[PDB]
Design a protein around this ligand. Structure first.
Ligand code: HEM
Length: 214
């Protein structure tokens, strides 16, 4: 479509359905998630967000990204560290895995943030708006399926205390995205990089599912 936010939604509709149909997610939605599986994804995401937010800080002043800088509201690295500490203990840093698919994703995140800053939006969009959407549904399912503390320990990465209303916040995020100045061509490169982003997540779920099956 014309507005970037609409073009992104249109461009990733197919890979989104594919992400929901991935074995790992299908099971998660139906309440079939294990402590081992949840630990795995959380660990993998700690790396992805670490790399992602490291690149964001690098371009927080770059006009091609500046409008999407929301450290207090969205940044997930700290929350993920809290979950990892809960699941793996004080020495989580050294106990957590770093799978091939996660590294491949982290790599892409450094390339983009490093030399293609105008595409970082595609990656932030894919992870953050997803956390505020499907993530909100999954959060509730996980607390039940994993019989977690009613206080929220273990699910801090799904919690955005600095956001009163995710739905409302996403509309504001879309507004900001449509504020970005870029040619139709670069805009296409953006929607195209968001598919790549979903594909990196898909590949990551397929790998973890493969790792878990045993
Ligand atoms: C358990 C599987 C999933 C379910 C059930 C799900 C469900 C949804 C729903 C219902 C929406 C629409 C907004 C809302 O009403 O909340 C949405 C949006 C979105 N999801 Fe997912 N989702 C899932 C997995 C994912 C994954 C794995 C990603 C990314 C890696 C993702 C990324 C997004 C994005 C970026 C949007 C916003 C699209 C836009 O409006 O431009 N989702 N999801």
């Amino acid at each position: 479509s014309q507005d970037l936010s609409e073009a992104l939604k249109e461009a990733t509709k197919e890979v989104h359905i594919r992400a929901e149909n991935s074995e790992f997610m299908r099971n998660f939605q139906k309440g079939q998630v294990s402590r081992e599986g949840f630990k795995l994804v959380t660990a993998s995401l700690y790396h992805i967000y670490t790399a992602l937010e490291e690149e964001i800080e690098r371009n927080k002043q770059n006009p091609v990204y500046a409008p999407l800088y929301f450290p207090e509201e969205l940044h997930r690295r700290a929350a993920l560290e809290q979950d990892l500490a809960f699941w793996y203990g004080p020495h989580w840093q050294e106990a957590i895995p770093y799978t091939p698919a996660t590294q491949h994703y982290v790599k892409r995140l450094h390339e983009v943030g490093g030399t293609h800053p105008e595409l970082l939006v595609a990656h932030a969009y894919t992870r953050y708006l997803g956390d505020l959407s499907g993530g909100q549904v999954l959060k509730k399912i996980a607390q039940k399926a994993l019989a977690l503390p009613s206080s929220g320990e273990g699910l801090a990465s799904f919690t955005f205390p600095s956001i009163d209303n995710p739905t409302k916040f996403k509309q504001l995020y879309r507004a900001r995205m449509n504020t970005l100045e870029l040619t139709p061509e670069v805009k296409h490169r953006v929607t195209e990089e968001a598919k790549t982003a979903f594909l990196l997540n898909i590949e990551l779920f397929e790998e973890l599912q493969a790792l878990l099956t045993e």
